[PDB]
Amino acid sequence: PNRLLCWSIYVTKKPDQSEEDHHNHVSKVNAPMFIPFLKKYGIVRYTVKHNDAYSKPKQAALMAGQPEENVLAYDTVFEMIVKDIESIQTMQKDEEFLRTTIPDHFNFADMTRSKGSLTWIEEFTFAL
């Protein structure tokens, strides 16, 4: 099958880190650090999803009174679209990738409360 894949990391922020510092680090340090590696290994698209002070009032409106347990709690989601998992695997072997990005997790992520996901996707883009 010719199915695009999505490799997603669901990130809980580091304990006692403020929302603002978490998202500033993700947007201004971590995501920029990944871009060169993502390009090099053929990633199709890279998306960072933020659940923060800007989105939370919009979320509250759409949730319209529902209980908080019904809301996915992760602070950031990283999503990499790829055509094959070889791209992810090879980038995960890159020693420069590993030595550069691993020390950074301690600056923004509670990795014990974070999760990974590899799915296949169907996408519909409505722009003409």
Q: Who's near 52: CB < 8 A, 6+ residues apart?
A: 19, 20, 22, 23, 75
Q: Interface with a copy of itself includes 2 (CB under 8 A)?
A: no
* 29 vs 85 by CB, closer to a copy of itself: 85
Among 20, 29, 59, 83, binds a copy of itself (CB under 8 A): 59
**Residue 113 exposed, middle or buried by CB count within 10 Å (0-12, 13-18, 19+):** middle
Listed residue (6, 5, 23) closest to 14, CA to CA: 23
Among 33, 55, 96, 98, binds a copy of itself (CB under 8 A): 55
The window from 14-22, 99-107, 116-124 that contacts a copy of itself (CB under 8 A) reads 116-124
* 18 vs 66 by CB, closer to a copy of itself: 66
Amino acid at 113: R
